[PDB]
Amino acid sequence: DTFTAAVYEHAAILPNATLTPVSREEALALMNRNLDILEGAITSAADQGAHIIVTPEDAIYGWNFNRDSLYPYLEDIPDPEVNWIPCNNRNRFGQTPVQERLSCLAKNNSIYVVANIGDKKPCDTSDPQCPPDGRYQYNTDVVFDSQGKLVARYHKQNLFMGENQFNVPKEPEIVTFNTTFGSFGIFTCFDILFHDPAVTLVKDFHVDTIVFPTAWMNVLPHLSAVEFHSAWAMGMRVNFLASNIHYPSKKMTGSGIYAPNSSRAFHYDMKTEEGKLLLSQLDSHPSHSAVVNWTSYASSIEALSSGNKEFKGTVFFDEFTFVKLTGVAGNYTVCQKDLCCHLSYKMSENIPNEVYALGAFDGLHTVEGRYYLQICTLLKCKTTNLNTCGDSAETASTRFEMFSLSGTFGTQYVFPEVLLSENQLAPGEFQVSTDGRLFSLKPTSGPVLTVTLFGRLYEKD
Numbered sequence: 001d002t003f004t005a006a007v008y009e010h011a012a013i014l015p016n017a018t019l020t021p022v023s024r025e026e027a028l029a030l031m032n033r034n035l036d037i038l039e040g041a042i043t044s045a046a047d048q049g050a051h052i053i054v055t056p057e058d059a060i061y062g063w064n065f066n067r068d069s070l071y072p073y074l075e076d077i078p079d080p081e082v083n084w085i086p087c088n089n090r091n092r093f094g095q096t097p098v099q100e101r102l103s104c105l106a107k108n109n110s111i112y113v114v115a116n117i118g119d120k121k122p123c124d125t126s127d128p129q130c131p132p133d134g135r136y137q138y139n140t141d142v143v144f145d146s147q148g149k150l151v152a153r154y155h156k157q158n159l160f161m162g163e164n165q166f167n168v169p170k171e172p173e174i175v176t177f178n179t180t181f182g183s184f185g186i187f188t189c190f191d192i193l194f195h196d197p198a199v200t201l202v203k204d205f206h207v208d209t210i211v212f213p214t215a216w217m218n219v220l221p222h223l224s225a226v227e228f229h230s231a232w233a234m235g236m237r238v239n240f241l242a243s244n245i246h247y248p249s250k251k252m253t254g255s256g257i258y259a260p261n262s263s264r265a266f267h268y269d270m271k272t273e274e275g276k277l278l279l280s281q282l283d284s285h286p287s288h289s290a291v292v293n294w295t296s297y298a299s300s301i302e303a304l305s306s307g308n309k310e311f312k313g314t315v316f317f318d319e320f321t322f323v324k325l326t327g328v329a330g331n332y333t334v335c336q337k338d339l340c341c342h343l344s345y346k347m348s349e350n351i352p353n354e355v356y357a358l359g360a361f362d363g364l365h366t367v368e369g370r371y372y373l374q375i376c377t378l379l380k381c382k383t384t385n386l387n388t389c390g391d392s393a394e395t396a397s398t399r400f401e402m403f404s405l406s407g408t409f410g411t412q413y414v415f416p417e418v419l420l421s422e423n424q425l426a427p428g429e430f431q432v433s434t435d436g437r438l439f440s441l442k443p444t445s446g447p448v449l450t451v452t453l454f455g456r457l458y459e460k461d
């Protein structure tokens, strides 16, 4: 059993902004301008045989708001158990034009529609957790099935810095929807960096596929959208539908359809101001059974390199312990605290003025969010100057003939990243072993930007 998946990267129409909150008529007019663009993508996806389409987070109203400027864009999204086809019973819950439009878009095109809108929940001064505003506001994903029915409502758990227009739910919402093409889980953007609901959906609810609306700001060398999202899909052994905002000015680009074995289709574009519809087939019930012990090989072996020239290098505000790669072939081991990284490599050639390092990181990230990390990285240094290792590098010339990366990870949640020049994925050029090794299967098709094993220690957050 297979199905055709679709994702749309959206060049959104943002509100003029701001000073005084707009009227509902003004807020709706803008939302409709974006909805007409998404209508265009939903119709082509359906015309091309897609069973489901994901549209990005904030695709309908943007990310620039305060609680009051956001209010006019919000709808009361009922509990999905309510059993409702907004396209067929338009006024069941009062004024809900966005839900009606999304419902008609899913019904008329006979396709599942995943979209991200805003929820309003009026509350009383009686309940303690009610805001002084008199309402809860949530960044909400909605799923409409092929018949137009609301089958999922998900309020974002992990709000990012400056998402002050939204509220965090009391308890994490573990939202799934079942179809004839597998069990589906859903979460949004920053959620992918945390345990709840992200990990829970995969390990406890045994979902086949994750639908992921995102408005992601790219951060090289490890946190580029296509790079990390496909890494997470591979590490969690699940299908992954990533639909991103297209805004190169904020480094927003990178949508794709990912399988447990490799990427299936991806899109990265920093040049044009245009959106992109992507389609690809996936297995409805992929195998999830391929277990990896991430510390096995690494904890067995002894240090591959002795007495080495080591230095501190900054990666996304985190101080990694590096070791320069001297030679067109080598065996290095670098440790930072509880983590020890091993690398075996052989380059296609020894390209001049191109420096590579092997890095190790064991510690807590605190800049613009807090999360414990354990990272082993083979990265291309931006320049020859060793103090530029870990700074975002977008191009490279060194193809590798072979690589094998591993670490003494104190976690079972490790995401294998392989990124080529210029933000290109490498399907299916690498594989992960039951031993916890990220290794090449053929020489890389393009130059290497990074080969990382991105570890996550949820308890140490």
Ligand SMILES: *[C@@H]1O[C@H](CO)[C@@H](O[C@@H]2O[C@H](CO)[C@@H](O[C@@H]3O[C@H](CO[C@@H]4O[C@H](CO)[C@@H](O)[C@H](O[C@@H]5O[C@H](CO)[C@@H](O)[C@H](O)[C@@H]5O)[C@@H]4O)[C@@H](O)[C@H](O[C@@H]4O[C@H](CO)[C@@H](O)[C@H](O)[C@@H]4O)[C@@H]3O)[C@H](O)[C@H]2NC(C)=O)[C@H](O)[C@H]1NC(C)=O
Residues within 6 Å of the ligand: 178, 179, 180, 183, 285, 286
């Ligand atoms: C979400 O929806 C899915 C899809 O509808 C739900 O999963 C279904 O659950 C049914 C009830 O448990 C399952 O029915 C039983 O099937 C077995 C036969 O085995 C299956 O053969 C199928 C056809 O060849 C095949 O599709 C199926 O799935 C596969 O399972 C293998 C592992 O075995 C896995 O590798 C694949 O990836 C895939 O998952 C099985 O191989 C029948 O023997 C069984 O007996 C009957 O019980 C009936 C009463 O329920 C009775 O009517 C009848 O007389 C028999 O006694 C069931 O018919 C069905 O397999 C399963 N479908 C899939 C694709 O998994 C899931 O439960 C829903 N989840 C939630 C949370 O609601």
Ligand SMILES: *[C@@H]1O[C@H](CO)[C@@H](O[C@@H]2O[C@H](CO)[C@@H](O[C@@H]3O[C@H](CO)[C@@H](O)[C@H](O)[C@@H]3O)[C@H](O)[C@H]2NC(C)=O)[C@H](O)[C@H]1NC(C)=O
Residues within 6 Å of the ligand: 293, 294, 295, 296, 299
């Ligand atoms: C993944 O592989 C590693 C390596 O085998 C596993 O870790 C190891 O787990 C064993 C327990 O089965 C630990 O052994 C214990 O050692 C202590 C002394 O250190 C001793 O007192 C105990 O009697 C026992 O022998 C071992 O130390 C530990 N090693 C490391 C590096 O953590 C890991 O648990 C495997 N995980 C899975 C789920 O397969």
Ligand SMILES: N#C[C@@H]1CCCN(C(=O)c2cnc(NC3(c4cncnc4)CC3)nc2)C1
Residues within 6 Å of the ligand: 057, 058, 063, 159, 160, 163, 189, 190, 215, 216, 217, 218, 219, 223, 224, 250, 367, 368, 369
């Ligand atoms: N702008 C805007 C968005 C609007 C939607 C809410 N946002 C996020 O959840 C969000 C979170 N994180 C990122 N990107 C990374 C990051 C970037 N810089 C610092 N910390 C992490 C790389 C993780 N991208 C988006 C921010």
Ligand SMILES: *[C@@H]1O[C@H](CO)[C@@H](O)[C@H](O)[C@H]1NC(C)=O
Residues within 6 Å of the ligand: 101, 104, 105, 108
């Ligand atoms: C969907 O179709 C119905 C009639 O078939 C129509 O009333 C409705 O406006 C359509 N909506 C969209 C958004 O296509």
Ligand SMILES: *[C@@H]1O[C@H](CO)[C@@H](O)[C@H](O)[C@H]1NC(C)=O
Residues within 6 Å of the ligand: 329, 330, 331, 344
């Ligand atoms: C690296 O290690 C492998 C495996 O032990 C070995 O075959 C290879 O010759 C080594 N290369 C260098 C240059 O140390």
Ligand code: NA
Residues within 6 Å of the ligand: 063, 064, 065, 066, 162, 163, 164, 165
């Ligand atoms: Na805000």
